Design an enzyme around this catalytic site. Structure first.
Site, PDB file in Angstrom:
ATOM      1  N   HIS A 112       0.806  -1.223   0.000  1.00  0.00           N
ATOM      2  CA  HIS A 112       0.000   0.000   0.000  1.00  0.00           C
ATOM      3  C   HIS A 112       0.851   1.292   0.000  1.00  0.00           C
ATOM      4  CE1 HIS A 112      -3.514   2.528   1.518  1.00  0.00           C
ATOM      5  NE2 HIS A 112      -2.508   3.158   2.095  1.00  0.00           N
ATOM      6  N   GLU A 113       1.827   1.354   0.909  1.00  0.00           N
ATOM      7  CA  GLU A 113       2.758   2.484   0.985  1.00  0.00           C
ATOM      8  C   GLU A 113       3.461   2.837  -0.324  1.00  0.00           C
ATOM      9  OE1 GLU A 113       2.195   4.545   3.207  1.00  0.00           O
ATOM     10  OE2 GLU A 113       1.151   3.028   4.464  1.00  0.00           O
ATOM     11  N   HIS A 116       1.559   5.131  -2.802  1.00  0.00           N
ATOM     12  CA  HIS A 116       1.833   6.564  -2.455  1.00  0.00           C
ATOM     13  C   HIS A 116       3.174   7.024  -3.060  1.00  0.00           C
ATOM     14  CE1 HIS A 116      -1.759   6.870  -0.108  1.00  0.00           C
ATOM     15  NE2 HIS A 116      -1.365   6.083   0.888  1.00  0.00           N
ATOM     16  N   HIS A 122      -5.455   7.733  -2.043  1.00  0.00           N
ATOM     17  CA  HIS A 122      -6.313   6.671  -1.521  1.00  0.00           C
ATOM     18  C   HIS A 122      -7.537   6.417  -2.389  1.00  0.00           C
ATOM     19  CE1 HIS A 122      -4.819   7.034   2.917  1.00  0.00           C
ATOM     20  NE2 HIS A 122      -4.390   5.890   2.417  1.00  0.00           N
TER      21      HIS A 122
HETATM   22 ZN   LIG Z   1      -2.389   5.149   2.626  1.00  0.00          ZN
END
Ligand SMILES: [Zn+2]
Ligand SMILES: [Ca+2]
Ligand SMILES: [Ca+2]
Ligand SMILES: [Zn+2]
Length: 157
Positions: A112-113, A116, A122
Site C-alpha cells: 500500500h505504501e 503513495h 487513496h
Molecule cells: Zn495510505
C-alpha cells in the site's frame, strides 16, 4: 506528482527484529514486484547511499513532522514522487510485523505504501489495496486488485 525515469532505486535502511532479515527483504521485494508487473517502472536495490526510495522503521518523533503513535493506529506512511523525502516510505517500529494473517502483514502494508511512493492517492473502493484501512488478504497468490491497476495505468500507462 510522478517520476520522470523508469528505473528507480530503493534502500532498506534498517530492519524489524520480529522477522528474519531474509523475510523483510522478501516482503519489500514482492511489494515492489506487484507494481512492476502493471507499469513501465523498474526497481533496483542498493545497500548504502542515497536511493530514490528510502525504506525505514521508526518510532514516534522521527524528523518529518508526521510522528507515529505507538502500538496499532497509524501503521506507516509514504511521500509522493519528488526529490529528498519524496517517494520515501516509513513504517511504525512499535508494531508487531508478521508474514502471516496476524496483525500486521509487512508485505501488504509495504504494498500500500509504495502506491503513495509512485503518485497514487487513496481509493474509495473497499476491495482496493489503496483503501485507507488495513485488511488482511491471502498473500500466497496475491496480485493487485483491478482498481489499483487502473490507478498506476492512469499515471504511467
Ligand atoms: Zn495510505
Ligand atoms: Ca502505530
Ligand atoms: Ca526519496
Ligand atoms: Zn515519517
Amino acid at each position: 506528482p510522478k517520476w520522470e525515469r523508469t528505473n528507480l532505486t530503493y534502500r532498506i535502511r534498517n530492519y524489524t527484529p520480529q522477522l528474519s532479515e531474509a523475510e523483510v527483504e522478501r516482503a519489500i521485494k514482492d511489494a515492489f514486484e506487484l507494481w512492476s508487473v502493471a507499469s513501465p517502472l523498474i526497481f533496483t536495490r542498493i545497500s548504502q547511499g542515497e536511493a530514490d526510495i528510502n525504506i525505514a522503521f521508526y518510532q514516534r518523533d522521527h524528523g518529518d513532522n508526521s510522528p507515529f503513535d505507538g502500538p496499532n493506529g497509524i501503521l506507516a506512511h509514504a511521500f509522493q514522487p519528488g526529490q529528498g523525502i519524496g517517494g520515501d516510505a516509513h513504517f511504525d517500529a512499535e508494531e508487531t510485523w508478521t508474514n502471516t494473517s496476524a496483525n500486521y502483514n509487512l508485505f501488504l502494508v509495504a504494498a500500500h505504501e509504495f502506491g503513495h511512493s509512485l503518485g497514487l492517492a487513496h481509493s474509495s473502493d473497499p476491495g482496493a489495496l489503496m483503501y485507507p484501512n488495513y485488511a488482511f488478504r491471502e498473500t500466497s497468490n496475491y496480485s493487485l486488485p483491478q482498481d489499483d491497476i487502473d490507478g498506476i495505468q492512469a499515471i504511467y500507462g
